[PDB]
Every structure is written in structure tokens, then in C-alpha cells.
Amino acid sequence: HMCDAFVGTWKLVSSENFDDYMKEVGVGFATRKVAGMAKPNMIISVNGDVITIKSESTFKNTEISFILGQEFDEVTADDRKVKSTITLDGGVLVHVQKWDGKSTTIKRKREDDKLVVECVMKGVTSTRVYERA
Ligand SMILES: Cc1ccc(C(=O)CC(C)(C)CC(=O)O)cc1Br
């Protein structure tokens, strides 16, 4: 029942500062423009200890399955090859991605009826708000 309140199908409804976050990550112009249009469906499910987060989008579909605290390989939507570790900290899913000596942290939280995604690269934060689909 660890991630019960995250499970479901969610649709992106708002984004703030995503272009700057993507710049800080190293995403190039064309990918930033096309990625920034997308309104993905995020599908979260749990089976035993395995959490799956899928993103269905007009830009790029992605899928990760993981066990909390156990590092895994991830190919991000912008085609970075990262090493990811996801933990639960006070009810927040905390996702750290490492690649090329860089790091970004993505936090996912339930707030009211929304799922709020905060993406941080150095001093730059983007906030992406999802509602139930
Ligand atoms: C270029 C690009 C396109 C999409 C995404 C994501 O959707 C994942 C995050 C950042 C975690 C945001 C979210 O899930 O809404 C990331 C990058 Br970089």
C-alpha cells in the first residue's frame, strides 16, 4: 500500500519553467521546443515491490519499473542514459538521475487531487502538475 495514492492515470495540466529546466539539463533547441508542447499521460502502477511509471506522450513514450532504493538504468525522454535511484521520503517519491558527472532530482508528491512533479537541476526548478485522467 506504499504508493497507493500515486497509482492511477494522470494527465499533465500545467507546467512552469520547464524550458529553463531542460536548458540546465542540456537539452538542445529542437528537443526543447517539441518536448515542451507535450501533454503526457503518466500511468503509475504497483505490483508487489515493483513500481512502474509510464509516460505516454506525443513527444516520446517512456517506461520505468523499479524497486525503491535499488539503482537502475533509465533512458530518458531526451535520450540521456542515466543511472536512477528512487526512494520514498516522507511520502514523496524522490528520483535521482546521474549521468556524465551531472545529477538531477525529480520529486513526485500528492497534493489535494493533483500529483505535483518538481524537477531540479542546480538552481533551476520546474513544476509540472498532473490531474486524474
Ligand atoms: C525533454 C524532456 C521531456 C519530457 C520529460 C519528462 O516528462 C520527465 C520529467 C522531467 C520527470 C517531467 C514529467 O514527468 O512531467 C523530461 C525531459 Br528532460
Measured in angstroms, how far is the CA atom of residue 77 from the centroid of ligand 1? Answer: 6
Method used to solve the structure: X-ray
Residues 6 or more apart whose CB falls under 8 angstroms from that of 53 comprise 42, 43, 44, 63, 64, 65
| CA atoms of 38 and 26, how far apart (whole Å) | 18
Measured in angstroms, how far is the CA atom of residue 64 from the centroid of ligand 1? Answer: 13
> Which range marks the domain in which residue 41 is found?
4-129
**By alpha-carbon position, which residue is closest to atom 15 of ligand 1?**
128
Q: Are residues 76 and 59 in contact, defined by beta-carbon separation less than 8 angstroms?
A: no
Neighbours of 74 (CB within 10 A): 19
Residues 6 or more apart whose CB falls under 8 angstroms from that of 23 comprise 32, 124
| CA atoms of 13 and 75, how far apart (whole Å) | 24
**By alpha-carbon position, which residue is closest to atom 6 of ligand 1?**
77
**By alpha-carbon position, which residue is closest to atom 8 of ligand 1?**
77
**Positive or negative CA dihedral for 75, 36, 85, 50?**
negative
Measured in angstroms, how far is the CA atom of residue 36 from the centroid of ligand 1? Answer: 9
| Side chain identity, residue 53 | I
Question: 126 is written with which cell numbers?
Answer: 520546474
Question: 7 is written with which cell numbers?
Answer: 497509482
Residue pointed to by grid coordinates 513527444: 59
Resolution of the solved structure (Å)? 1.1
DSSP assignment, residue 79? Answer: -
- Give the total number of structural domains in the chain: 1
For position 122, which CATH number holds? 2.40.128.20
